[PDB]
Amino acid sequence: SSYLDYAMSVIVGRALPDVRDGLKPVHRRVLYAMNVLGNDWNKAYKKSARVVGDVIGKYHPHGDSAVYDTIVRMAQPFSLRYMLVDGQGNFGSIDGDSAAAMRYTEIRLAKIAHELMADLEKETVDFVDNYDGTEKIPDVMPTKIPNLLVNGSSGIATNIPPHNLTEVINGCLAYIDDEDISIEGLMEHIPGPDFPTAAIINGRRGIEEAYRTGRGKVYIRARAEVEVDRETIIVHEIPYQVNKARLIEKIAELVKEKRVEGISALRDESDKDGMRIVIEVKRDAVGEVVLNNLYSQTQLQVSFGINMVALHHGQPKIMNLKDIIAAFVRHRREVVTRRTIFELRKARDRAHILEALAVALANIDPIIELIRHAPTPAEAKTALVANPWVAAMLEDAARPEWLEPEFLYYLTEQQAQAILDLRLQKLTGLEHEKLLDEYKELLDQIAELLRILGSADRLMEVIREELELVREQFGDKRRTEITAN
Amino acid sequence: SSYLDYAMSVIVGRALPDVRDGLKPVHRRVLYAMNVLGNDWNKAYKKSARVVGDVIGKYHPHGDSAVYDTIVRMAQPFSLRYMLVDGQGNFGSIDGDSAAAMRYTEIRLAKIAHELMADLEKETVDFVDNYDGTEKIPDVMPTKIPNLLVNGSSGIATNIPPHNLTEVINGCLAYIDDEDISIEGLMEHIPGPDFPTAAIINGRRGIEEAYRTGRGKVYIRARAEVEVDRETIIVHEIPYQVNKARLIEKIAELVKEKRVEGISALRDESDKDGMRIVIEVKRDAVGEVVLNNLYSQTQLQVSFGINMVALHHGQPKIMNLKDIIAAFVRHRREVVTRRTIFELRKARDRAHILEALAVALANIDPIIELIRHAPTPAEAKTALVANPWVAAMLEDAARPEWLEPEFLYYLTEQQAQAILDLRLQKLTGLEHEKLLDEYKELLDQIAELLRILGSADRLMEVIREELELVREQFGDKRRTEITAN
Amino acid sequence: GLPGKLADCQERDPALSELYLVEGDSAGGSAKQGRNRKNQAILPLKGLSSQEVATLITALGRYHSIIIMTDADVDGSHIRTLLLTFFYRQMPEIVERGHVYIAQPPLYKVKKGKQEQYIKDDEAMDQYQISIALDGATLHTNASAPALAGEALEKLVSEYNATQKMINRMERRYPKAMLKELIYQPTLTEADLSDEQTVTRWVNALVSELNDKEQHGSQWKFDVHTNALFEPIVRVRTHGVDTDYPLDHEFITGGEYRRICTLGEKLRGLLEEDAFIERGERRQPVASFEQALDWLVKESRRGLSIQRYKGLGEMNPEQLWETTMDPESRRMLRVTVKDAIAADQLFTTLMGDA
Amino acid sequence: GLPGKLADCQERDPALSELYLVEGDSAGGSAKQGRNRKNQAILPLKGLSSQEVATLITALGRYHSIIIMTDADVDGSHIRTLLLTFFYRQMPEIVERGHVYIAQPPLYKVKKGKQEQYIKDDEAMDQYQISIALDGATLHTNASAPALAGEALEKLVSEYNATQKMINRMERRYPKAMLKELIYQPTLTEADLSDEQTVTRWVNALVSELNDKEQHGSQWKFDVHTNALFEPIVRVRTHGVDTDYPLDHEFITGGEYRRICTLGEKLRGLLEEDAFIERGERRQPVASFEQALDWLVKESRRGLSIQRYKGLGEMNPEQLWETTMDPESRRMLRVTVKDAIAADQLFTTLMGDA
Ligand SMILES: [Mg+2]
Ligand SMILES: [Mg+2]
Ligand SMILES: [Mg+2]
Ligand SMILES: [Mg+2]
Structure with missing residues (x-):
């Protein structure tokens, strides 16, 4: 095509998320870097600089302060409804205060992030090259969480609000029982968005319209209460994506120009107990008349223009609620399948290796002699190769599909070196019985894996089980309120 | 002391180099990071971003663009007389053109840098903690090159010019034969500085004064020749630390204001053959009268205020030429000694391990039985521990000093596991004879190492041999000219 | 100034x-x-x-x-x-x-031994891989042409790749794996469609092959739709969801399926299944023509290195x-x-x- | 605003x-x-x-x-x-x-089991290590005082460390290793100096010890200077260069060498060479008092972790x-x-x- 269509196709590649894991290249690189590092939730904290460098070095060499900001936002409780990064230290405030230097702050993967990249090692996702071509990065994460819905996204375009995990897991399970369910059948589990910073959603039409056409405009309002002791307004929670400090400056400026009236004292009493904005109504003025006048002139009220755009097949799409849910469930099917196939292959290859090790022990003495005989390992090896050598246990499934028909029991060049490699500690008569267990336990596993690949409804049962495990382990209460009136 | 004396003691810690390897913390970290990476001269090139990240991650987390600049300068031929970094790609010009992005440029250690960090693994230098305390960095490099003299330094204070390696190696060897040699005896090998960017040094008094008192002011002049075909001035080389482009702008501005006269055409014909500045003398004007008038108003002539300040014992000192040479030679003695002691210890520990392995083979069958007997490795291990088991070969030096007197031949808990760990491939009757060689060859080595530690003049002979190897492998011709007139 | x-x-x-x-x-x-x-x-x-x-x-x-x-x-x-x-x-x-x-800076730098080469395009990079692969190569079949090489081989290799390119250009419409097997399977004729017994056994042979070859977790099945004209249908269960693909009268009539048949016709005429390929010092028996082409490329690349440029600053x-x-x-x-x-x-x- | x-x-x-x-x-x-x-x-x-x-x-x-x-x-x-x-x-x-x-943010955060502690200074960090080390500790010697603990032990440990601190404060003037051995070696007296035979055998015993203990590549030697008053001299070859240290009449008279002797006097009086140290559940025989103190610290630190703060932003x-x-x-x-x-x-x- 034209050079313009390509240049537009790459600018859109960075800007939009992937419906399957709601991650952009930057996030997926940063997260994968943490996983390779072994920066788990159950290991000690590592300095941010340690991760930022690893990322810059291998996956995304485009500015240290850029990569850090990415990790910061993935750590903050006010920007992500379900944080993917566990962070200790100063990570900036809702006011817009910056985070501490990357050499001071500490971070590790959140428990939930390990689920995002669950089964990443087992060839369940495609891999792409890095900038220099020395490293490989996942094209997508084999995620168990519908992040694009749960945590959402923003386009510099697309605007997707976060959602409660519990609700969404339900809606997903609902789509699993009936593929034909309506947008209103889904909205029975997913009433609306659930922002990290809890607040009040006044209109319910906007959300219904957005889940249906992928586009809509919703209302978000601050949770303010009037209090006696003169009169004072107290804000417990404000709209998502709202800078509290600049909000304050705004109200002070409004009273200066006198566009708003009835405020004598405006102070920010936010502290370790939570958010607290104080506005003391003047005498001869009503509190809720001042409040509504504020809503009308203030960021206290914000309309959230939902615009669900996300890359489905490497191509931009405007999708309704169902389309996003279906895409997650097709992605799960693929990951689950690909996982199994890999698990089966690995099981085969391990059972195949074991068979050689087991046979080696019974015939161990003659082998030992041979080893003593040939000076060069390859000469003793060739000797092992020349002559073939628990019958109930042996009784074809265990053998890998690639393994030839030819290979008494026949041995592989590799197996010959495996017997040569085995150490003197394994020789003990206790290791024999132990290996016998692993072998037999793998047969039961391969048999189970085969049961899974064959049965299409079985695979859909394992998926449902995984979604439930996610709803219980990581599910939590709603925070924003929907009040259609 | 006072908080001020400390704050001044740390600001000086970053600014000054270490007389022993002429490196500042930044350089030593960047270089050590490359060594750990395995970014050798004989391995493929690695992207700069790869190193910059590793540095930022583990050793010096203070800005990516800062760390890169450091690597850049260590790559440029015009800034370092002997480059410590081998670089492929655009690394900026004498004009001040920046270097290419760190994701495009490629780098590996120069052959000479491997000498700077020669014998770094053998506990020849002290190690300090990194910012977080998870990594260790060398307090200094076990260098075979007198870098502080060779490549010099700059203080943002100290100002040390680069020097020819060949000359300096000589001067070092001269200090080795007679510890009492004079500054004039040294200047017989080290006439003066030898800048990467070759040029003409007019005064010889300044350099003699600086090698004597550590401080002095020297003259540097551009190598310009007048040419016929009207008249044109052509500069082949300019003063060290001089921006060629801004030099050009200066001359153009001078002719504008008419402070200098006799120039019709000023063009920069610098190309792949080398540096070439062209100044076409106007008619009715002399070339060399224009030239001298330029020297007088132009950066073409620059006085280089030598001020040799460097941290000797973690403390700032103004040192003359001899003091810098002596410090390098004391440092060599220490590295050489510490190296030997380590080499000896390692030899002992390896010979000790071998003795167990060798004895194991002769008594192998009884051992094999035991291994078959006890289910748990620790139970078979304890069995090996209970009963003690090439006589000419065995005939105490090989045994480490830490090894107890008690340990037929006695075995160590560790040795028991070593026999248990040995693989089946080593069993061959060819490995036995091979190990016998290593053992015997190590005895000859320990005996040699002992000869070295005892003889103080022997150690001074190995040092002299190492300096010569450096002068031959990395020695090159002079570039700047000294013309005392 | x-x-x-x-x-x-x-x-x-x-x-x-x-x-x-x-x-x-x-x-x-x-x-x-x-x-x-x-x-x-x-x-x-x-x-x-x-x-x-x-x-x-x-x-x-x-x-x-x-x-x-x-x-x-x-x-x-x-x-x-x-x-x-x-x-x-x-x-x-x-x-x-x-x-x-x-x-126009090169996109590649290929080097074999002392020789180095600067390649401008990905199209030129393709022309270079083919060139290496073919140089010194000859395909020995049992068909009327004992040895196939030079200009003649280039013709074949070009047609083979042209078909695989088209296959990938119509990949979203039909499974890539299936179209590859239509190449080996006998052609289905407009006249063949009118008969049901031949059509059924055909689509049975097709599907039966795809299943035995499938390494991934996929399930192939066949069905024949009766049209008052018999039309085959290939249903594939993957991953857990099964889709079905109709071989319309248009498809069998389409130029796309013709280019697949013609290729198969030439390939089947050349007795590809049993053959030898040498390039050029050594040779190895191949069960398929593509297995011979894969081998050519494995040879051509054996000792060469390829560097891709992304920016000017990457080079001295x-x-x-x-x-x-x-x-x-x-x-x-x-x-x-x-x-x-x-x-x-x-x-x-x-x-x-x- | x-x-x-x-x-x-x-x-x-x-x-x-x-x-x-x-x-x-x-x-x-x-x-x-x-x-x-x-x-x-x-x-x-x-x-x-x-x-x-x-x-x-x-x-x-x-x-x-x-x-x-x-x-x-x-x-x-x-x-x-x-x-x-x-x-x-x-x-x-x-x-x-x-x-x-x-x-004043803490410089440390020590935690043993459920207990955590915030330590302000490096001086307080020292007071804390001593405290742990000593708690539950008792030193059993054969001297007049069978068991040495509590306030009495603290006195000893403090004196021992005070001497080692002074040693490190006069390290550039005299080898650290040598001053440590003067503690164990018998004291040299102003009166002792007047006699040559005693002085020679003394500095011989000193040097003879340093050499047997030396793990690094260093060589100790002794020499006695005759002053018309006999003064010992310790020459050490390290690394390849030998320096000599004079034990001046001032040195033996100096308070610095006195604090070394007094320490040695107490240590030698407590029969330190043969002893037992328990802290506090278990114990292990020690050949030296410092070997007992090293053991105390090895116990105190066994299960604790120490985090140093460099910046405020490091903490939530x-x-x-x-x-x-x-x-x-x-x-x-x-x-x-x-x-x-x-x-x-x-x-x-x-x-x-x-
Ligand atoms: Mg970018
Ligand atoms: Mg609250
Ligand atoms: Mg700094
Ligand atoms: Mg030139």
């Missing part, structure tokens, strides 16, 4: 001299250390267009052939776009007269000379008034509002 | 309220998420002194006790210096009245509360007019010229 910002050349006559335009950060330095003083002048730019710079370029010109050296990537190539759009707008005639060109001044600015070596590309037009459009597109 | 830049508190009465001053980037956020709304106000600063900021701080004040939270490092602590120097200069009286304080808002701004927990430090004076001087020193 001008001196200090521009690196001029000895040549004084326009139409005998060329001006290079680079991004200081990308090639500003390397260009200067690798140019030819005689006729190559260098003007580094930084920008997103600096106004002082824009007066330097104007005050510059002189030079008849002006080259724009810039990375191909979207981020780096912006400086090129700003130039083309500035040219078209402020200076229309200079582009029309063919004074402006665009340097000397290397930059040999590739991009050495008259004999360099591979330049002149810009048309229609290209400057598109560069003006693109700039405006990025500028949603101004 | 003021609102939006300052986070005020409920308390309205000065002398009942405290204003925190932080570096936005270091603690700006964490301070706000961890303060106490009642009486703690927070003013983040950024700077190198912003003028708008300087008018915000002035327009701020109100508050009687103003705390300056800033890192200890030279780079980060600059913001503190700029404040103290600005105070002293522009507002002299506010420092004199004791309104300005300086938060909650943690920052418990350590630095919680009235009960916090450990503040008031600044004197003499400290603001030194902060003015330092600022000026960095400002070579202005």
Whole structure:
């Protein structure tokens, strides 16, 4: 095509998320870097600089302060409804205060992030090259969480609000029982968005319209209460994506120009107990008349223009609620399948290796002699190769599909070196019985894996089980309120 | 002391180099990071971003663009007389053109840098903690090159010019034969500085004064020749630390204001053959009268205020030429000694391990039985521990000093596991004879190492041999000219 | 002024001299250390267009052939776009007269032994892989033509690849794996469709093959639709969801399925299943023609290395000379008034509002 | 204006309220998420002194006790210096009245089991290691005092360490290793010096010991200088260079060598060579007193972890509360007019010229 269509196709590649894991290249690189590092939730904290460098070095060499900001936002409780990064230290405030230097702050993967990249090692996702071509990065994460819905996204375009995990897991399970369910059948589990910073959603039409056409405009309002002791307004929670400090400056400026009236004292009493904005109504003025006048002139009220755009097949799409849910469930099917196939292959290859090790022990003495005989390992090896050598246990499934028909029991060049490699500690008569267990336990596993690949409804049962495990382990209460009136 | 004396003691810690390897913390970290990476001269090139990240991650987390600049300068031929970094790609010009992005440029250690960090693994230098305390960095490099003299330094204070390696190696060897040699005896090998960017040094008094008192002011002049075909001035080389482009702008501005006269055409014909500045003398004007008038108003002539300040014992000192040479030679003695002691210890520990392995083979069958007997490795291990088991070969030096007197031949808990760990491939009757060689060859080595530690003049002979190897492998011709007139 | 910002050349006559335009950060330095003083002048730019710079370029010109050296990537190539759009707008005639060109740095650097090669395109990179693969190669079949090589082999290899390319171009419509097997399976005829017994056994043979070959977790099945004309249908269960593909009367009539058959016809005529392939010192028996082509490529690549360039700054001044600015070596590309037009459009597109 | 830049508190009465001053980037956020709304106000600063900021701080004040939270490092602590120097200069009286304080974040965080501890200083960190080491410890010697513990042991341990500290304070003058051995070797007396035979055998015993103990590549030798008064001399060859150390009449007379002898006298009186040390459940025989002290410390540290803080931003808002701004927990430090004076001087020193 034209050079313009390509240049537009790459600018859109960075800007939009992937419906399957709601991650952009930057996030997926940063997260994968943490996983390779072994920066788990159950290991000690590592300095941010340690991760930022690893990322810059291998996956995304485009500015240290850029990569850090990415990790910061993935750590903050006010920007992500379900944080993917566990962070200790100063990570900036809702006011817009910056985070501490990357050499001071500490971070590790959140428990939930390990689920995002669950089964990443087992060839369940495609891999792409890095900038220099020395490293490989996942094209997508084999995620168990519908992040694009749960945590959402923003386009510099697309605007997707976060959602409660519990609700969404339900809606997903609902789509699993009936593929034909309506947008209103889904909205029975997913009433609306659930922002990290809890607040009040006044209109319910906007959300219904957005889940249906992928586009809509919703209302978000601050949770303010009037209090006696003169009169004072107290804000417990404000709209998502709202800078509290600049909000304050705004109200002070409004009273200066006198566009708003009835405020004598405006102070920010936010502290370790939570958010607290104080506005003391003047005498001869009503509190809720001042409040509504504020809503009308203030960021206290914000309309959230939902615009669900996300890359489905490497191509931009405007999708309704169902389309996003279906895409997650097709992605799960693929990951689950690909996982199994890999698990089966690995099981085969391990059972195949074991068979050689087991046979080696019974015939161990003659082998030992041979080893003593040939000076060069390859000469003793060739000797092992020349002559073939628990019958109930042996009784074809265990053998890998690639393994030839030819290979008494026949041995592989590799197996010959495996017997040569085995150490003197394994020789003990206790290791024999132990290996016998692993072998037999793998047969039961391969048999189970085969049961899974064959049965299409079985695979859909394992998926449902995984979604439930996610709803219980990581599910939590709603925070924003929907009040259609 | 006072908080001020400390704050001044740390600001000086970053600014000054270490007389022993002429490196500042930044350089030593960047270089050590490359060594750990395995970014050798004989391995493929690695992207700069790869190193910059590793540095930022583990050793010096203070800005990516800062760390890169450091690597850049260590790559440029015009800034370092002997480059410590081998670089492929655009690394900026004498004009001040920046270097290419760190994701495009490629780098590996120069052959000479491997000498700077020669014998770094053998506990020849002290190690300090990194910012977080998870990594260790060398307090200094076990260098075979007198870098502080060779490549010099700059203080943002100290100002040390680069020097020819060949000359300096000589001067070092001269200090080795007679510890009492004079500054004039040294200047017989080290006439003066030898800048990467070759040029003409007019005064010889300044350099003699600086090698004597550590401080002095020297003259540097551009190598310009007048040419016929009207008249044109052509500069082949300019003063060290001089921006060629801004030099050009200066001359153009001078002719504008008419402070200098006799120039019709000023063009920069610098190309792949080398540096070439062209100044076409106007008619009715002399070339060399224009030239001298330029020297007088132009950066073409620059006085280089030598001020040799460097941290000797973690403390700032103004040192003359001899003091810098002596410090390098004391440092060599220490590295050489510490190296030997380590080499000896390692030899002992390896010979000790071998003795167990060798004895194991002769008594192998009884051992094999035991291994078959006890289910748990620790139970078979304890069995090996209970009963003690090439006589000419065995005939105490090989045994480490830490090894107890008690340990037929006695075995160590560790040795028991070593026999248990040995693989089946080593069993061959060819490995036995091979190990016998290593053992015997190590005895000859320990005996040699002992000869070295005892003889103080022997150690001074190995040092002299190492300096010569450096002068031959990395020695090159002079570039700047000294013309005392 | 001008001196200090521009690196001029000895040549004084326009139409005998060329001006290079680079991004200081990308090639500003390397260009200067690798140019030819005689006729190559260098003007580094930084920008997103600096106004002082824009007066330097104007005050510059002189030079008849002006080259724009810039990375191909979207981020780096912006400086090129700003130039083309500035040219078209402020200076229309200079582009029309063919004074402006665009340097074409190689995308690859292949080296076998002492030999090295600079490849411009991904199309040229394909022509090079084929070339290596085929050189010294001959395919020995039992068919009327005992040995197949030279121009004849190139014809085959080209047709084979042409089909695989088309296959990938119609991949979303039909499974890639299935279309590959239609090549080996006997052709289905318009006349064949009218008979049901032949049609059923055919689609049975097809599906029966796909299943035995399938390594992934997929399930193939066949069904025949009766049309008052018999039409085969291939249903595939993957991953847990099964889709079905109809082989319409159009499909069998379509040129796409014909190119597949013709290929299979030639392949089946050449007794590909049993054969030998040598390239060229050694040879190995192959069960398929594609297995022979895979082997060719495995040979061609055995000792060579391939370096891809993403930016100018990746290479030294000397290397930059040999590739991009050495008259004999360099591979330049002149810009048309229609290209400057598109560069003006693109700039405006990025500028949603101004 | 003021609102939006300052986070005020409920308390309205000065002398009942405290204003925190932080570096936005270091603690700006964490301070706000961890303060106490009642009486703690927070003013983040950024700077190198912003003028708008300087008018915000002035327009701020109100508050009687103003705390300056800033890192200890030279780079980060600059913001503190700029404040103290600005105070002293522009507002002299506010420092004199004791309104300005300086938060003292812990340098360590020790945790054994459920217990955690915040240690302020490296001196307190030393007091803590000794404390742990000694707790439950008793030294069983054969001397007049079968068991040595409690207050008595602390006396010994303190003297032992005091000597090792002095040793390291006179390390450049005499080898550290040698002075350590003078502790074990019998004392040399002014009267002893007058005799040569005793002096020679003494310095022979000394050197003979150092050599057998030396693990590094060093060579010890002895020589006695005759003074018309006999004075021992210890020459050591290290690494390849040999230096000699004279035991002057002054040295033997010096208080430094006396503190070494007294220590050795007590140690030799306690029959240290043969002994048992328990701390406190278990015990192990020791050949030396220092070998017993090393063992104590090996026990004390067995299950504990130690975290050193380098910056405020290293800890969460909650943690920052418990350590630095919680009235009960916090450990503040008031600044004197003499400290603001030194902060003015330092600022000026960095400002070579202005
Ligand atoms: Mg980018
Ligand atoms: Mg609250
Ligand atoms: Mg620094
Ligand atoms: Mg030249």
